[PDB]
Amino acid sequence: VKGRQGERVRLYVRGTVLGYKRSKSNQYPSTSLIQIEGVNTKEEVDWYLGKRMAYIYKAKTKKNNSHYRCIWGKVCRPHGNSGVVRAKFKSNLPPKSMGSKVRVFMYPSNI
Amino acid sequence: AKKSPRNPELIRGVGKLSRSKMYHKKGLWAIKKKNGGSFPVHKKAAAVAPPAVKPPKFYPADDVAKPLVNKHKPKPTKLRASITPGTVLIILAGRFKGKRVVFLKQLKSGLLLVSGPFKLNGVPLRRVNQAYVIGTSTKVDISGVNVEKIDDKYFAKQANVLPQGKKDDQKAVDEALIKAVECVPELKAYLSARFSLKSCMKPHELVF
Amino acid sequence: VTYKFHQYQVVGRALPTENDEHPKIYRMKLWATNEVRAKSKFWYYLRKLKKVKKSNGQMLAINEIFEKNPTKIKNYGIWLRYQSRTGYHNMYKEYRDTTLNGAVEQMYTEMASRHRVRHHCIQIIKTATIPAKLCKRESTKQFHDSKIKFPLVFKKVRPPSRKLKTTYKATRPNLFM
Amino acid sequence: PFKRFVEIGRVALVNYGKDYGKLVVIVDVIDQNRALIDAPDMVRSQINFKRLSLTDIKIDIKRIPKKKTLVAAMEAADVKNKWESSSWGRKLIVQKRRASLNDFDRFKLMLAKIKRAGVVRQELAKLKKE
Amino acid sequence: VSGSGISARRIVVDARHHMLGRLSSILAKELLNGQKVVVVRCEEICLSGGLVRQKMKYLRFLRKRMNTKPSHGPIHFRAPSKILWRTIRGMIPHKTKRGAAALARLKVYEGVPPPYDKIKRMVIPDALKVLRLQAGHKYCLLGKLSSEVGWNHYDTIKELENKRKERAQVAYERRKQLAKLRVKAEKAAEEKLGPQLAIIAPIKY
RNA sequence: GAUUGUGGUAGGCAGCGCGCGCCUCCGGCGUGCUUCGGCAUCUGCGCGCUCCGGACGCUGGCCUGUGGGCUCCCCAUUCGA
Ligand SMILES: [K+]
């Protein structure tokens, strides 16, 4: 009915990069604050604890016949009460990723 | 030879019985009485003399460090309770991501042996890591499926062309699996369809 | 069941001496968030009203008092004296609650709200369970109705929990009484 | 106006907290903010009105009745069946059932819905062309 | 306010009967999080305190001007949409690139201009007057204040909104007729599919 | 769920199983003290096991490549200044 052209199966949820763990006057970019769509309480975060995440972005040059790049991470612990999480990546996320979407996968699975 | 454990474990590393009851059960009193009120002394096992290793061809200028002994030995990988023979699994990664497959058994290495069946969804006999799998509540009878001869060595590389023997074995295995699947209505379509997340579908709320 | 304020009966006396082999034993009914603070206030009152200090005094007993029937509503009267910005005054108040602990918590909250009197500036002189016919305040007497009937004028709209909270809604809330 | 009132015998739904989804009976009123509620499977205790949603059901009881009397009144009024049969009460049950569906059940429901949608679309097209 | 967390191309908000400050805070957070927001019917925004207090506040704002060069600011916009835009800017670090980008993701309109007149419009419960303001307390419409302080497009907006509402009423009547036809079709098709209705029954509301 | 493996000549320390007795083997059979449940009272040797004197194991990708690394250079962004 739609006639769309794209990924046929989605096995991940989206996450918005809010920023870094920080105080009013200090910033710690080693930790990233991520909001996962559909997660509204720290109790709900328990399911995603330890789940792998990928930050996919585009580069000007081609690497292995592709402009796509990926920085992997995972969910570490809940942040606050509203479902935000603290996440760690192999390298600190660039500040320009603020407001961009990361993919939160369903693995490693516990079910 | 005792055919049953003398001291069952209440928890890991703690026995149900104390030292006095263990003394009574083990029969140390009987051994002492038979031997004449004294325990029998057993000579220490004689060590094997080291083999006459030939002299080395080279002598290193530095004394290489020998690592300290590690007393920890790995245990077999655990299988989740939600995964039992005949359980339907959802693959979350790889070229078969989203496919629904039937679980057959766990191999020695800890990986899971699964089948599509191949005809239904194109998934052959394959090994899938437990960490990249979701165990659902759908179970299909697999009593008539014989996979005894298949083990971790069946998938070992010999290092392009699939031998016909593997195809025949997969067909033989899948015949009974499909026969069992046909019993449950709509199970064929369920196994032939992939799992996907639609709008407002929350993984942490789905029961699977 | 957790109460912020607990009722204790504290019993104490002055240390026995040669002159007084069996000194008078004093008891008080006090309100405090803990038994330690109840004992502290007991010694404060004993020092201020009987000349018996904690240093030269003896602690005998302390027991919590629980409402006999926390399943039923009662009318509670509280006689208290408080300190304002310009002096001290006496005050009698009435409350309705299942337990006297809840009534005392209400009393503290209301004193704070209406007179800006902090907790440490309030002394409770007397407490009692008042029958319906003997209540003096119109606020408590208005619910002494066999057929009490009113609509919920003010109801706040919220999801059962934050799990269902959403920033955007397709339609505005539909409210009626 | 004011189709619903808080009353002795009025049945209310707990709309917030750990007790969400439960039916209780208002057996007394403490003050403008909280009342005394009761039900067969709980201990009569106080609750703030902000956590109660009044229903259209009411039972004939006196204030602070006995547990047996309250149960008898609820059974005579058939509170459970009336609430369950009503659309408002059925809504919570349907939400719970939807939450409880499993993957295979969800797939079967999807198949049924697709078939019904196709048949309904054909029927509607025929009606329009008529 | 952590943020909505939704993934959408854009969100259209009907600002009617929304408290100005709370809606502004929620939308500022949404814009900072990377959302694109279109606000319509800004003239229907509600301000607590009443018309008199808000008018005096706006006159106090109008007093502020660079003494030696009034053209250097502050700029006193009169239209409701610009008032909402400035209020939002007040809650955003607009002097940084991040704040400027967040501001650039926001559109504000008076009334409902096209194509947003045929796009679903949502509301913000946390800023709704019905939930935030007790009945009887003083409030004023943003459009009324703007007209009092020098906005001269209120009547045109009213006329255009009346025309749009008439067209929307006609469309709604057509949709209701279509819905009745669809219910008739469903009734006709009921007898065709038994088992499917049986599986669907325990889920229907 | 998260961070982490510092050391590199030790089978130590602590606890416990199997054989040195038998029977009908989810257990039972001997001497003492018991609160009648039980008890470090008899508790020795040989071979083994463990939450036991600081991480080990398996698999995969890649190796002249649009690969990997970078403390170098020019920039952009968040925080600081
Ligand atoms: K670890």
Those residues whose C-beta lies under 8 Å from the C-beta of residue A55, and which sit 6 or more positions away, are A17, A70, A71, A72, A73, A89, A93, A97, A100, A102, A103
As a whole number of angstroms, the longest Cα–Cα distance in chain A is: 53
* Parallel/antiparallel/unpaired status of strands E106-108 and E37-40: parallel
Sign of CA dihedral C121, C126, C131, C135: negative
With a CB cutoff of 8 Å and minimum separation 6, the contacts of B94 are: B128, B132
The per-residue b/e assignment along B179-201, b for 16 or more CB within 10 angstroms, e otherwise, is ebbeeeeebbebbebbbebeeee
Q: Where are the strands (E) in chain B, listed by range?
A: 9-11, 14-15, 87-91, 100-106, 112-115, 126-128, 133-139
Flag residues 6-65 of A with CB < 7 Å from strand F: 19-20, 22, 25-27, 29, 49-50, 62-65
Distance from C-alpha of C34 to C-alpha of C5, rounded to nearest angstrom: 8
Cα–Cα separations (whole angstroms), residue C171 to D27, D89, E128: 35, 21, 11
Q: Is C158 exposed, middle or buried (0-12, 13-18, 19+ CB in 10 A)?
A: middle
How far from the centroid of its chain's Cα atoms is residue B32's Cα? 44
**Beta strands A68-78; B87-91: pairing state:** unpaired
Measuring CA to CA, which residue among B100, B103, B67, B52 is closest to residue B82? B103
Q: B122: which residues sit within 8 A by CB, 6+ positions away?
A: B116
Q: How many CB atoms lie under 10 A from the CB of residue E174?
A: 10
CA C14 to chain centre: 29
Closest-CA residue to C175 (of B146, E94, A46, E130): E130
Whose CA is closest to A82, among C163, D110, E181?
C163
Amino acid at site B5? P
3-state secondary structure of D72: helix
The CA distance from D113 to C15, in Å, is 85
Give the 3-state secondary structure of residue D55: strand
Comparing CA positions, the residue from A104, A100, A72 lying closest to residue A85 is: A104
- CA distances D77 to A59, D9, D29, D69, D80, Å, are 70, 11, 22, 12, 9
CA angle B189-B191-B197, nearest 5°? 95
**Collapsed DSSP state (helix, strand, coil) of residue B75:** coil
User: Burial level of E110, CB count in 10 A (0-12/13-18/19+)?
Assistant: buried
Q: Compute φ and ψ for E20, nearest 5 degrees.
A: -60, -50
CA atoms of B41 and B118, how far apart (whole Å)? 65
- The residues that bridge with D130 in the sheet, in sequence order, are none
Other CB atoms within a 10 A radius of the CB of residue C132 amount to 13
User: In sequence order, what are the residues at sequence separation of 6 or more whose Cβ sits closer than 8 angstroms to the Cβ of residue E23?
Assistant: E13, E15, E45, E84, E124, E127
Q: Which of D55, D117, D38 is nearest to D92 (CA)?
A: D55
How do strand C25-32 and strand C6-14 relate by DSSP bridges?
antiparallel
Cβ-defined contact of B206 to D103 (cutoff 8 Å) = yes
Paired with E11 in beta bridges are E37
Element spanning A18, H or E? strand A12-22
DSSP letter assigned to residue B67? P
Q: Supply C88's token pair.
A: 């001290």
**B18 CB closer than 7 A to any strand F atom:** yes
Residue pair D90/D84 in contact (Cβ under 8 Å)? The answer is yes
Token output for B93: 């990664």
Tell me the structure's resolution in angstroms, rounded to a single decimal. Answer: 2.1
**SS3 call for B130:** helix
Half-sphere exposure of A32 (CA within 13 A, CB side): 31
Burial pattern B73-92, b for ≥16 Cβ within 10 A else e, equals eeeeeeeeeebebbbbbbbb
> What does the alpha-carbon distance between residue B114 and residue B125 come to, in Å, rounded to a whole number?
6
Q: How many CA atoms lie within 13 A of E166 on its CB side?
A: 5
Q: How far apart are CA E17 and CA E44, in angstroms?
A: 6
CA–CA gap between residue E88 and residue E27 (Å, rounded)? 7
Length of chain A: 111
Q: Is the dihedral of CA C131, C133, C138, C144 positive or negative?
A: positive
Asked if residue E19 lies in contact with residue E47, where contact means CB atoms within 8 angstroms, the answer is: yes
Chain F nucleotides close to protein (CB under 7 A) are: 1-3, 7-12, 15-23, 25-32, 38-47, 49-58, 60, 66-68, 76-81
Strands (E), chain D: 10-14, 23-29, 34-38, 45-48, 52-58
Phi and psi torsions of D115, nearest 5°: -60, -45
User: How long is the CA B147 to C1' F27 vector, in angstroms?
Assistant: 39
CA angle in degrees (0–180, nearest 5) for E198-E201-E205: 170
Q: How far are the Cα atoms of A19, A21, E198 from residue A28, in angstroms, in the given order?
A: 10, 5, 57
Closest CA to E44 of E81, E74, E12, E77: E81
Dihedral angle, C-alpha A62, A65, A68, A72, nearest 10 °: -110
Q: How far apart are CA D30 and CA D35, in angstroms?
A: 5
Q: Which residues contact E106 (CB under 8 A, 6 or more apart)?
A: E27, E31, E36, E37, E39, E85, E88
In a 13 Å sphere around the CA of C128, the CA atoms on its Cβ side amount to: 12
Phi, psi of E152 (to 5 degrees): -115, 25
How was this structure determined? It was done by cryo-EM
Q: CA–CA separation, B114 vs B95, rounded Å?
A: 15
Question: CA neighbours within 13 Å on the CB side: how many for E118?
Answer: 5
Closest Cβ opposite residue C175 in set E6, E126, E130:
E130
Q: Which residue has 């808080």 as its token pair? A: D6
The H-assigned helical ranges of chain E are 20-32, 51-63, 80-89, 97-104, 129-132, 142-148, 154-190, 194-200
Taking phi first (over 0 means left), then psi (-120 to 50 degrees means alpha), and beta for anything else, what does residue E112 get? Answer: beta
In chain E, which residues have their Cβ closer than 8 Å to the Cβ of D116? Answer: 189, 193, 196-197, 200
Query: Would the CB atoms of A105 and B93 count as touching at under 8 Å?
Result: yes
Does residue E188 contact residue D123 with C-beta atoms inside 8 Å? yes
Bridge partners of C83?
A: C88
User: How far, in Å, are A34, C45, E80, E107 from residue E11 at the CA level?
Assistant: 21, 65, 20, 10
| Listed residue (C153, D16, C168) closest to E126, CA to CA | C168
Tokens of C83: 């300190």
CA distance A28 to A21: 5
Query: Residue C110 gets which letter from DSSP?
Result: H
Residue B59 beta carbon within 7 A of nucleic strand F? no
Count how many residues are written for chain D.
130
Q: Residue B74 Cα, ligand 1 centroid: separation in angstroms?
A: 14
Angle E97-104/E20-32 helices, nearest 10 degrees? 110
Classify residue E90 by its DSSP letter: T
Return the closest-CA partner of residue B80 out of B116, B134, B128: B134
Q: Which of residues 171-200 of B touch strand F (CB under 7 A)?
A: none
Which residue's structure tokens are 């790049």? Answer: A69
How many residues are there in chain E? 205
Q: How many angstroms does the Cα of residue B72 sit away from the middle of ligand 1? A: 14
Query: Nearest residue (Cα to C1') for F9?
Result: B66
Looking across all nucleic acid strands, the nucleotide with the smallest C1' to CA distance from residue A52 is: F1
* Other Cβ atoms closer than 10 A to B155: 15
Chain B nearest C-alpha distance from A30 (Å) = 27
Q: Give B87's strand partners.
A: B139
User: What are the structure tokens assigned to E29, written together?
Assistant: 């957070």
What are the helix (H) ranges across chain B?
A: 19-26, 28-35, 118-121, 164-183, 187-192
